[PDB]
Amino acid sequence: MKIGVFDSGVGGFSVLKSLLKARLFDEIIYYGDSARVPYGTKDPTTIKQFGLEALDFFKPHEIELLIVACNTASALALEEMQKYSKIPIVGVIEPSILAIKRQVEDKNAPILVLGTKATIQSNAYDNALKQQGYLNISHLATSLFVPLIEESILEGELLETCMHYYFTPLEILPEVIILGCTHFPLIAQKIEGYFMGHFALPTPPLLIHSGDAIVEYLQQKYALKNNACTFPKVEFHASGDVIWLERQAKEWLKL
Amino acid sequence: MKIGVFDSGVGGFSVLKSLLKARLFDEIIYYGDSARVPYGTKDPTTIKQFGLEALDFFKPHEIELLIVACNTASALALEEMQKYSKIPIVGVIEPSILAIKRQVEDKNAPILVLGTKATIQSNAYDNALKQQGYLNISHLATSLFVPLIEESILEGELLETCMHYYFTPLEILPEVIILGCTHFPLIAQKIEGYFMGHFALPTPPLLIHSGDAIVEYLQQKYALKNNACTFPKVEFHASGDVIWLERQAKEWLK
Numbered sequence A: 001m002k003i004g005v006f007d008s009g010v011g012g013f014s015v016l017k018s019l020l021k022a023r024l025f026d027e028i029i030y031y032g033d034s035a036r037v038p039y040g041t042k043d044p045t046t047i048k049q050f051g052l053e054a055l056d057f058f059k060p061h062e063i064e065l066l067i068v069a070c071n072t073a074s075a076l077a078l079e080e081m082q083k084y085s086k087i088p089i090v091g092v093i094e095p096s097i098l099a100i101k102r103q104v105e106d107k108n109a110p111i112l113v114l115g116t117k118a119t120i121q122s123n124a125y126d127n128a129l130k131q132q133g134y135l136n137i138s139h140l141a142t143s144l145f146v147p148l149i150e151e152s153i154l155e156g157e158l159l160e161t162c163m164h165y166y167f168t169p170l171e172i173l174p175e176v177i178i179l180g181c182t183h184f185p186l187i188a189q190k191i192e193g194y195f196m197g198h199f200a201l202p203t204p205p206l207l208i209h210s211g212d213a214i215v216e217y218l219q220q221k222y223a224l225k226n227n228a229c230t231f232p233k234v235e236f237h238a239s240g241d242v243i244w245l246e247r248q249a250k251e252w253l254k255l
Numbered sequence B: 001m002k003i004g005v006f007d008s009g010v011g012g013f014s015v016l017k018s019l020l021k022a023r024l025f026d027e028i029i030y031y032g033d034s035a036r037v038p039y040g041t042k043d044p045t046t047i048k049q050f051g052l053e054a055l056d057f058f059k060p061h062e063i064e065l066l067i068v069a070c071n072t073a074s075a076l077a078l079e080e081m082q083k084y085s086k087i088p089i090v091g092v093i094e095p096s097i098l099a100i101k102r103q104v105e106d107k108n109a110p111i112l113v114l115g116t117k118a119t120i121q122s123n124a125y126d127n128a129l130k131q132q133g134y135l136n137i138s139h140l141a142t143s144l145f146v147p148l149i150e151e152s153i154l155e156g157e158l159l160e161t162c163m164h165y166y167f168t169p170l171e172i173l174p175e176v177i178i179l180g181c182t183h184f185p186l187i188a189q190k191i192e193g194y195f196m197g198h199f200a201l202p203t204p205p206l207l208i209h210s211g212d213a214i215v216e217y218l219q220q221k222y223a224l225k226n227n228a229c230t231f232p233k234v235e236f237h238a239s240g241d242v243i244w245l246e247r248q249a250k251e252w253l254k
């Protein structure tokens, strides 16, 4: 099975890491729009067009399924992309809602959604959660986490201060935190550590990882493919420098 | 005179602000490539291609001069753009060198260049300064200042921590700091304050503002008096949502 994975840049590698572990797909065509990243700071019209242009990229590749690894593109462009695609397109938002339903029994559990400005502005998560009966949802655009993570600021005073900046105004302590952005898994332990330290919690809030949630969805849509692939072929493509993009895979994938 | 101003996004508004104050031009066409910003985190070939495409944008506008307000495009793309342009293109690097020549008599004065990653890696400032005999040049890509400033984080603990992050390893106290990025004028006083606080200075280092340096250059080159329109015709264009761009202009120009 040959698939595509689309992201604004290298963030999509956090989804790719999950995909690789699932051993579902024999061939993966990765495309990161690294000339135009970030998407999260930009507007619905721009991101929609970016999503359609991604469809054009994948045409000659004869993929069977397209994964939109980007939470921003999932929130803003997925519906438009599905309108103009014959293949299934799967984004990272809906599978996370499904993961919530499996992991969060109490409809009143406080859930906090973290994402880019565009993702949070869309209310994609809030709407889908409300539709599933969840009553206690907060959201926060933790925009600066993205550039910090791009700069490998994954610990230390600057990361702590940035987390404190965004989290300090929170009205409700979350029991569940959705990592609604490709980059956030890289600081998941730090986020857990923030809440435990600041609120004297012996264990952290439950974190939802977009890559693991999409994998859980795919593992049952393509059940015949579980553990099918001994070692996948992966092609790396970028609109920016493709060596720059591929170079980052080692870190993100823990190669 | 009708001119164009090119930037990656809204940062160019710090140059536009200088330009408007100087009353040099009757008409200004501003274009911010806000669908693709930042340029600073990307590679030379991509940035060069961005610069070439910006020329296409201005073609129907029949401008007489193109200003490249972006320090990143100036450092990486200016030479390529000039190669494909029939009109003069002026960037923000060379005018700042000329300002330093005027203002910094001591060739061994410690100069610190701040810029995006791409700008700093290009060594465009270092090379130009060495060419003019300056011997004591330091450089620092203060990359995260850009997103902080985009988010209007112009004060407080986050900014202070970020400045500390970049400035603490410095072994030479600068006499001159080049604000080698469109965004940096918006934290100029905070940068001044950091060095005075942390290095125990009665006076801050001299800060070189790219917008002010290009104004000085343009007046001399075109023999301009500060007597064009107080309120010129200004058009705003963007590759992203132009309403979003203009909304920000209102904040940066104030």
Ligand SMILES: OC1CN(C2=Nc3ccccc3C(c3ccccc3)=N[C@@H]2c2cccs2)C1
Binding pocket: A037, A038, A041, A143, A144, A146, A147, A148, A150, A151, B037, B038, B041, B143, B144, B146, B147, B148, B150, B151
């Ligand atoms: O190296 C680091 C520097 N950097 C970024 N800086 C800029 C520069 C101009 C406009 C936007 C951004 C944002 C951003 C701005 C405001 C709020 C949130 C983000 N993130 C990019 C990014 C580049 C790649 C991913 S994010 C990455």
Ligand SMILES: N[C@H](CCC(=O)O)C(=O)O
Binding pocket: A007, A008, A009, A011, A012, A037, A038, A039, A040, A041, A069, A070, A071, A072, A073, A115, A116, A119, A146, A180, A181, A182, A183
């Ligand atoms: N891939 C984006 C993060 C980087 C960007 O803003 O493009 C997301 O998951 O929201």
Ligand SMILES: N[C@H](CCC(=O)O)C(=O)O
Binding pocket: B007, B008, B009, B011, B012, B037, B038, B039, B040, B041, B069, B070, B071, B072, B073, B115, B116, B119, B146, B180, B181, B182, B183
């Ligand atoms: N205009 C850019 C800053 C924003 C960007 O990285 O594109 C510069 O002056 O370097």
